[PDB]
Amino acid sequence: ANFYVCPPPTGATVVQFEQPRRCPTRPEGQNYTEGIAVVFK
Amino acid sequence: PLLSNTVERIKTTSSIEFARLQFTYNHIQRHVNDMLGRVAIAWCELQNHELTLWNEARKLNPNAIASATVGRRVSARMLGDVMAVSTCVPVAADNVIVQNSMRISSRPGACYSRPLVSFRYEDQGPLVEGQLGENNELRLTRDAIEPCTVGHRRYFTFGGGYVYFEEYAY
Amino acid sequence: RYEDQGPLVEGQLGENNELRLTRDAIEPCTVGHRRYFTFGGGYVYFEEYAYSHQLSRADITTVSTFIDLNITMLEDHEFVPLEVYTRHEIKDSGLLDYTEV
Amino acid sequence: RLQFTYNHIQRHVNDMLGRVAIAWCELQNHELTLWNEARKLNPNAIASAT
Amino acid sequence: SHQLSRADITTVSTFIDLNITMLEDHEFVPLEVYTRHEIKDSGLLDYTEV
């Protein structure tokens, strides 16, 4: 509940928006080799 | 292996549960990593598109955009393709008096669109005239003037609530 | 110029690296004129309707319009064969083994 | 026990995931009203992205 | 001039495709490297049966 008095801006303090990041990519994707298996104990 | 047309004695552990847990963890991990990753990817692309909205919103009302985009209540100014910013001075609510009438006694037919106020920076400072702004900001120049119209009913934010005016009067 | 050998074509710069053919961006001149405009990978600063100088983009303070969500992948984990007692242990826990005896 | 563990984690992860999908769809459908005014403000930038 | 069906216009997406797919149900069968019986029979002699 606090008011503010804002003076006209000056060129002394200049800020800029960020450029879009390089968005992450999905992993390589596991290379799965199908096969038939017999497990021995 | 398959493709679609497109001298020692080995000791075996008595519990497969390590392997099964491995399978469970791998399946849950793969699923959560995949979906979360997609979330993260969609999140990044979301902000990448959101910047397009932000580039025009900063033109619409630079003060509000800068306030958040920076993290402190600041006033911004469009100086071409960038915004010049300056920090605003906080003021307590009790140091603001709202003038009741927004009609201009010196110019018939022209009257203030936004409430006029008297404010003091300090409790003992001189009384300074101005007009209220949007989202509790103070404007020094009372140049927000419009032709007076019939059926004038307005709300304006003030402190922690709102102040209601009728017919260019409090 | 569209090509390196093409004729020189006049115009005015647009927004976000755009080139406009029409020079109709006119306004009344005002005192205390300072402007910045995006140019290539940086900015160009003008004063009083006169070119002042170029700026690199990193030279200007950058404020984040983005919300950081930091998702880190659940790392691969290996479960080793762990048993409170191995088969042999349990076999040896017997005070006597009839087979061995 | 693994069935219970997987079922509990799966039910939960699916719950919120589905909530994130629901909230994401609602988020876009909510954003279109912003976009339709943005496209009027500066059609070039929004078009390039869209 | 004339009315047109909506599909006559190329559609551009202002959405972000977030593609969340549910973790499918999985059944864990009773799996044992050695059953209680195999372990009992692994002993070369059983005093009971002998």
UniProtKB/Swiss-Prot annotation, chain A:
Post-translational modifications reported in the UniProt record: The cytoplasmic tail is phosphorylated by the viral kinase US3. Phosphorylation may be linked to a down-regulation of gB expression on cell surface.
Location relative to the cell: Virion membrane; Host cell membrane; Host endosome membrane; Host Golgi apparatus membrane
Glycosylation sites (chain numbering): 31
Family designation: Belongs to the herpesviridae glycoprotein B family.
Function per UniProt: Envelope glycoprotein that forms spikes at the surface of virion envelope and binds to the host cell entry receptors MYH9/NMMHC-IIA and MYH10/NMMHC-IIB, promoting the virus entry into host cells. Essential for the initial attachment to heparan sulfate moieties of the host cell surface proteoglycans. Involved in fusion of viral and cellular membranes leading to virus entry into the host cell: following initial binding to its host cell entry receptors, membrane fusion is mediated by the fusion machinery composed at least of gB and the heterodimer gH/gL.
Subunit structure: Homotrimer; disulfide-linked. Interacts with host receptor MYH9/NMMHC-IIA. Interacts with host receptor MYH10/NMMHC-IIB. Interacts with the host coreceptor PILRA. Binds to heparan sulfate proteoglycans. Interacts with gH/gL heterodimer. Interacts with gD.
Name the UniProt record assigns to this protein: Envelope glycoprotein B
Organism expressing this protein natively: Human herpesvirus 1 (strain F)
Positions spanned in the full protein: 110 to 150 of 903
